[PDB]
Amino acid sequence: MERKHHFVLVHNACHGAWIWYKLKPLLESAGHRVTAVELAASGIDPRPIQAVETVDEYSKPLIETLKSLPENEEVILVGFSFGGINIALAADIFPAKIKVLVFLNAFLPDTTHVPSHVLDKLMEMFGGWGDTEFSSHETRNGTMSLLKMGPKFMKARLYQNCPIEDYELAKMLHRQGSLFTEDLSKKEKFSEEGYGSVQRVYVMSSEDKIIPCDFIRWMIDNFNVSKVYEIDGGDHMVMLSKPQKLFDSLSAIATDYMG
Amino acid sequence: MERKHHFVLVHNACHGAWIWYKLKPLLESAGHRVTAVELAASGIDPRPIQAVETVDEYSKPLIETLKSLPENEEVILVGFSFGGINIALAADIFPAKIKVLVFLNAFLPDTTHVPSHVLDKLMEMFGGWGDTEFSSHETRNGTMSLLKMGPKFMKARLYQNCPIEDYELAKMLHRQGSLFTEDLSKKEKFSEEGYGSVQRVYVMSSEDKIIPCDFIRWMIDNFNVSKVYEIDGGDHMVMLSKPQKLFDSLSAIATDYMGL
Ligand SMILES: O=Cc1ccccc1
Ligand SMILES: O=Cc1ccccc1
Ligand SMILES: O=Cc1ccccc1
Ligand SMILES: O=Cc1ccccc1
Ligand SMILES: O=Cc1ccccc1
Ligand SMILES: O=Cc1ccccc1
Ligand SMILES: [Cl-]
Ligand SMILES: [Cl-]
């Protein structure tokens, strides 16, 4: 039988490992191994976002996960939404541990501009945040901008193609988070030798109301990927609205990178 | 269309409000109101159980929910597993805000023995902890016993009839918790005038492998209820394995306490 892979799955800001609860057993049934990483101050991590002052601190559970893998293991590393930035930071540290980066409705940064660049671009044109609550927290690293999604904004812009159960679950579990745009705007640029050396593919939802298709085409065009896979009918939260189709995309990526 | 109700849902130890994710929209699509409480150091509360040292602190979010209800509003208060102890404590405080207590696969304490009684009986009786991790934490008032379920134990004893997705979900959400056995042993008995005065019913899973159906009978004999409802094929996590049947039982309860 064909060889299986280890998928490492990285959630979006304000969410947690829990988002992967449908996708994980589909991947595992097909014989793959799955690690759903919980980022700092995410999901059931008992540590408020206010204690996680930088994007490196936020990402630390992923970096520790890659550090821990046995020698020469390579993973399919999937970053969702803000998880794109996480996986890019991880790839600049452990590029030989990554078979392919999977940017899933994700921020795809480049090696040319400041790491916040594609975030800053989206925020300029974002549209409505609805009932989302914005606040600040002062730190020895500067001021952190925090966000807590509002329920209307979740329903209209993230979860509009999800079953009602999933939306309810999300209301029970979403947390105050941050997109670390200040921290990102002054980090060093991602390197060509680390991040830039790693194979990458982009998986996009057709109905993502957060990360629209034109913005995606722009990021890709700014920083090329080897292949693009589309999920027809996916909302932003495509692991909840179309997990089977997400599984199909990841399965096509595992075949395409089985060498 | 006759009166709908406000259901207040109280989760078990080591879990959180998220367990009710299937039940809540069922109740709500039938016109009822639902509050799924999140107890201290549970679910997404960024506070470790070690910091919550007493059952009264654990239960505070429930107390604050009840306290904030409008004057004369009464709720159907559902307590799942250790949630039974929480709802009894709440009923000892605010009996007049509770139309009926629903003990769902729940510890059902009495008004004769110390509040830990039924918990101590289960701990003496139960042989199936498997890979669960027991540990202690010392407080200034004494030892606090803690527990963190193991995934084999979850699969065999709580979730054995749940969809695989729900078990995966629980693995990414459950937390170290506590049954507060030392603290409950030191508390005053539940009262006949508060808790004892509130109507109570019992809803049981026919396949509960953690609170065995015989142990449930022993509890009910020990401290009777008005009515027992049975969910055929439920595991302990019956809001995940048989949510529609649970919905049916709580709708039947809602009918039997229709508001004259
Ligand atoms: O896009 C945000 C939003 C908020 C409330 C209602 C509808 C949309
Ligand atoms: O609309 C307010 C706001 C605050 C911080 C970042 C983006 C928007
Ligand atoms: O460095 C930031 C900070 C935040 C809260 C308390 C103390 C320091
Ligand atoms: O819900 C029952 C239970 C029992 C032991 C540990 C956690 C939960
Ligand atoms: O089996 C029950 C038990 C209780 C506390 C510590 C160890 C075991
Ligand atoms: O209840 C725990 C358990 C542990 C190993 C195998 C089967 C059950
Ligand atoms: Cl995000
Ligand atoms: Cl419990």
UniProtKB/Swiss-Prot annotation, chain A:
GO molecular function: mandelonitrile lyase activity
Domain of life: Eukaryota
Site residues, Increases basicity of active site His: 208
Keyword Lyase tagged: yes
GO biological process: glycoside catabolic process; response to wounding
Protein keywords: Lyase
EC number from the UniProt entry: 4.1.2.10
Positions annotated as active site in the UniProt record: 81 (proton donor/acceptor), 236 (proton donor/acceptor)
Pfam families: Abhydrolase_1 (PF00561)
Entries under InterPro entries matching the protein: AB_hydrolase_1 (IPR000073), AB_hydrolase_fold (IPR029058), MES/HNL (IPR045889)
Primary enzyme class: lyase
UniProt effect for mutating residue 208 to N: Loss of activity
Catalytic activity as recorded in UniProt: (R)-mandelonitrile = benzaldehyde + hydrogen cyanide
PANTHER family per the UniProt record, alphabetical: ALPHA-HYDROXYNITRILE LYASE, METHYLESTERASE FAMILY MEMBER
Family: Belongs to the AB hydrolase superfamily. Hydroxynitrile lyase family.
Functional description taken from the UniProt entry: Involved in cyanogenesis, the release of HCN from injured tissues. Displays R-selective hydroxynitrile lyase activity. Also accepts nitromethane (MeNO2) as a donor in a reaction with aromatic aldehydes to yield (R)-beta-nitro alcohols.
Summary of subunit composition and partner proteins: Homodimer.
Protein name: Alpha-hydroxynitrile lyase
Swiss-Prot record, chain B:
Swiss-Prot/TrEMBL site (Increases basicity of active site His) positions: 208
BP terms from Gene Ontology: glycoside catabolic process; response to wounding
Function, in words: Involved in cyanogenesis, the release of HCN from injured tissues. Displays R-selective hydroxynitrile lyase activity. Also accepts nitromethane (MeNO2) as a donor in a reaction with aromatic aldehydes to yield (R)-beta-nitro alcohols.
Active-site positions on this chain: 81 (proton donor/acceptor), 236 (proton donor/acceptor)
Protein name stated in the entry: Alpha-hydroxynitrile lyase
Enzyme superclass (EC): lyase
MF terms in GO: mandelonitrile lyase activity
The protein's assembly and partners: Homodimer.
Entry similarity comment: Belongs to the AB hydrolase superfamily. Hydroxynitrile lyase family.
Chemical reaction(s) catalysed: (R)-mandelonitrile = benzaldehyde + hydrogen cyanide
Cross-referenced Pfam families: Abhydrolase_1 (PF00561)
Alphabetically ordered keywords of this record: Lyase
Superkingdom of the organism of origin: Eukaryota
Keyword Repeat assigned: no
Disulfide pattern: none
Outcome of mutating residue 81 to A: Loss of activity
EC number(s) per entry: 4.1.2.10
